[PDB]
């Protein structure tokens, strides 16, 4: 009775191969984490946004920089905060642990500090991350945790759950 839900689940159905499966698992993945990125900005009471290039970031924080002078990656974070002082860049994960964030620490960090200490604006990167099955938040952006010391959400995976599961259970061998 969700689109999301039952289009993952014609796609459940129809699928035969495991090189096709796990397409629709990547897409699930990333569905579990939209909707933990929508109700985290709406628990917190900031503009909702995905995959935001970093140049239009740029341009709306520093709407008279000299773009052209600078190579700015093309990276896309999910959102991000502007203070008048301080640049968040967000980013949501969902996961019972913390290697993929790790990842996405390190590359925002090597991609998108560069630049920004050229452009002069004080940047941070932030991830934040929910564990899927016991509910709690985990953040990594000491600006962040201050600008945010309550975080509150009321989240529920258990249709991801239901679709990955599944998913597994048609491909166990
Ligand atoms: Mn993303």
């Not at 897409?27 to 009471?45: K, M, S, T």
């Not at 996405?104 to 050229?118: A, F, G, R, S, W």
Request: glycine share 4%.
């Amino acid at each position: 009775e969700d689109p999301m839900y039952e289009q993952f689940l014609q796609r459940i159905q129809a699928v035969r191969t495991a090189t096709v499966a796990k397409d629709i698992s990547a897409d699930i993945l990333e569905a579990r984490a939209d909707y933990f990125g929508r109700e985290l900005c709406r628990a917190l009471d900031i503009e909702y946004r995905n995959n935001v290039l970093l140049d239009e970031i740029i341009l709306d924080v520093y709407p008279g920089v000299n773009l052209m002078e600078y190579n700015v990656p093309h990276v896309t974070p999910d959102n991000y905060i502007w203070t008048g002082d301080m640049l968040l860049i967000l980013d949501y994960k969902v996961s019972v642990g913390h290697d993929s964030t790790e990842v996405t620490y390190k590359k925002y960090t090597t991609l998108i500090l560069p630049v920004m200490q050229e452009i002069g604006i004080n940047t941070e990167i932030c991830i934040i991350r929910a564990n899927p099955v016991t509910n709690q938040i985990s953040i990594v952006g000491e600006q962040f945790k201050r600008l945010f010391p309550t975080i509150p959400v009321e989240l529920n995976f258990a249709r991801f759950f239901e679709l990955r599961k599944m998913l597994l259970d048609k491909f166990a061998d």
